[PDB]
Design a protein around this ligand. Structure first.
Ligand SMILES: NC(=O)C1=CN([C@@H]2O[C@H](COP(=O)(O)OP(=O)(O)OC[C@H]3O[C@@H](n4cnc5c(N)ncnc54)[C@H](OP(=O)(O)O)[C@@H]3O)[C@@H](O)[C@H]2O)C=CC1
Ligand SMILES: COc1cc(-c2c(C)cccc2C)cc([C@@H](C)C#Cc2c(C)nc(N)nc2N)c1
Length: 157
C-alpha cells in the first residue's frame, strides 16, 4: 500500500526555510511508530535537511542527480520507480513530492497542527468528499507538547 505521512497547520503549512516551523515531540513519536519496518520516500531537499538517516526502515530518496551516491540510502529518479517497491511505502515529503503524490496514494496519515505558523512550503488542498475519515484522534498536551494537534487517518473513497 501507498500512504502519505505529513504534518500541516491550519493553512496546510509544512515547513519554513527547510525545517518544520513548530516542534512537537508527540508528532515525532507518532511519526516514528508507523514508519518502523517499512519504506520511506523523500525529495532530496527533505533528506538534505535531515542528513542523518533513520534506523530500522528503508530510506529512499528521489532525485534526478545520478551523481549523488550517498552511503546507506537507496536512490530513485522517477515516479514509476515508486510503483516497483515491495511492502508498505510512505511519502514523507516535501511539498513538490506531496503535490505529485496526493492523487496516487491509497490513504493519508496527517497530523493536523491546530495553529497558524509562518511557512514557505505547503501541503496541497484536499476536500473531505474524496476522503473517508477512518480515524481522528486528539493529541494530548503536556509541558513538552504545547500545541493542540489531531492525528487523522484519511482513506480515499
Ligand atoms: N511538515 C512535514 O510533514 C514536512 C515538512 N517538510 C518541509 O518541506 C520543505 C521542503 O519542500 P520541497 O522544497 O518540496 O522539498 P522536496 O524534498 O520535496 O524537494 C523536491 C526535490 O525532489 C526531487 N524530485 C521531485 N520530483 C521529482 C521527479 N518527478 N523526478 C526526479 N526528481 C524529483 C527534486 O530533486 P532534484 O532537483 O535533485 O532532482 C526536487 O528538487 C522544507 O521546508 C521542510 O521543512 C518536509 C517533510 C515533511
Ligand atoms: C530527525 O528527525 C527529523 C527531524 C526533523 C526536523 C525537526 C523535527 C525540527 C527541525 C528540523 C528538522 C530537520 C524533520 C524530519 C522530517 C523527515 C519529517 C517529518 C514528518 C513529521 C515530523 N511528521 C509527519 N506527520 N510527517 C513527516 N513527514 C525528521
Amino acid at each position: 500500500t501507498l500512504s502519505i505521512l505529513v504534518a500541516h497547520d491550519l493553512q496546510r503549512v509544512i515547513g519554513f526555510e527547510n525545517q518544520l516551523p513548530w516542534h512537537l515531540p508527540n508528532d515525532l513519536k507518532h511519526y516514528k511508530k508507523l514508519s518502523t519496518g517499512h519504506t520511506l520516500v523523500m525529495g532530496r531537499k527533505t533528506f538534505e535537511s535531515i542528513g542523518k538517516p533513520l534506523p530500522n526502515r528503508r530510506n529512499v530518496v528521489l532525485t534526478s542527480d545520478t551523481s549523488f551516491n550517498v552511503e546507506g540510502v537507496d536512490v530513485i529518479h522517477s515516479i514509476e520507480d515508486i510503483y516497483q517497491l515491495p511492502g508498505h511505502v510512505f511519502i514523507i515529503g516535501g511539498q513538490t513530492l506531496f503535490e505529485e503524490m496526493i492523487d496516487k496514494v491509497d490513504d493519508m496519515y496527517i497530523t493536523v497542527i491546530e495553529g497558524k505558523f509562518r511557512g514557505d512550503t505547503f501541503f496541497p488542498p484536499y476536500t473531505f468528499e474524496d476522503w473517508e475519515v477512518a480515524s481522528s484522534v486528539e493529541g494530548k498536551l503536556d509541558e513538552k507538547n504545547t500545541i493542540p494537534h489531531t492525528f487523522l487517518h484519511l482513506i480515499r473513497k
